[PDB]
Structure 1
């Protein structure tokens, strides 16, 4: 167990099980390869892992997003995976914080804004 693909991270974050995110931890450290890159995401839209996780939420509580954030911030680059968004023709500038507002959840908005998601991004 050294590698996943984008699909299995998407599947895991869809379910929302934190007990597996530990693996993603080491999968961030090696090969100097990060989640903000174009490989751990789709290529058509640009939907990253955080967006995919948010697009399905257990009523109003999740357990996979937060650990993913402190894992990413430990070795992430310029964009804290929260300042990054889609580069699609249909969706340009649309980031995860817009999704969090759209799904009517105070908690996730709180985490995103306190973790470094600046509210100045044009969708």
Structure 2
């Protein structure tokens, strides 16, 4: 349960169960890695864990966003994955805030904006 691959992270965040986020805290402190690294995001697009969380919300709410945000702010790279951006030619600038807004989910927008968020990022 300690070592989780990016597919494992995607599967955990897709279902929406927050209790399966355990073990990542020791995981990134072990190999000295961060959630912002390319080792846990899609190489082609750049979709991250938060993005995969936002692409599916059970009735406009997820309980797995808060643990991920708090673990990232505890042991993250100076950008808490909220201002980290994709490098795709088709989605150059497709921010997480944009995905939160596009799904008409105000609550996750509030969470992201109170957990630090650069609105003026290019898209």
Q: Fold conserved (TM > 0.5)?
A: yes
Hey, which bits of structure 1, 4+ residues long, moved more than 2 A?
A: none
Deviation by residue 1:59-91 (Cα, 9 ceiling, x = unmatched): 111110111000001111121111111100101
Kindly indicate whether residue 7 of structure 2 is the aligned counterpart of residue 23 of structure 1: no
Instruction: Return the offset for 1:28.
Output: 2.1
Whole-Å separation in 1 of the counterparts to 2:2 and 2:16: 21
> Which blocks of at least 5 consecutive residues in structure 2 are unaligned?
none
Deviation by residue 1:10-30 (Cα, 9 ceiling, x = unmatched): 011000101111222221221
Whole-Å separation in 1 of the counterparts to 2:7 and 2:36: 15
| 1:117 match: secondary structure | coil
TM-score by length of 2: 0.96
Instruction: Return the offset for 1:40.
Output: 0.4
Corresponding residue pairs, total:
123
Equivalent residue for 2:77?
Answer: 77
Whole-Å separation in 1 of the counterparts to 2:19 and 2:2: 17
Equivalent residue for 1:116?
Answer: 116
Whole-Å separation in 1 of the counterparts to 2:28 and 2:17: 18
Equivalent residue for 2:56?
Answer: 56
Equivalent residue for 2:91?
Answer: 91
Deviation by residue 1:87-106 (Cα, 9 ceiling, x = unmatched): 00101111110000100011
TM-score by length of 1: 0.96
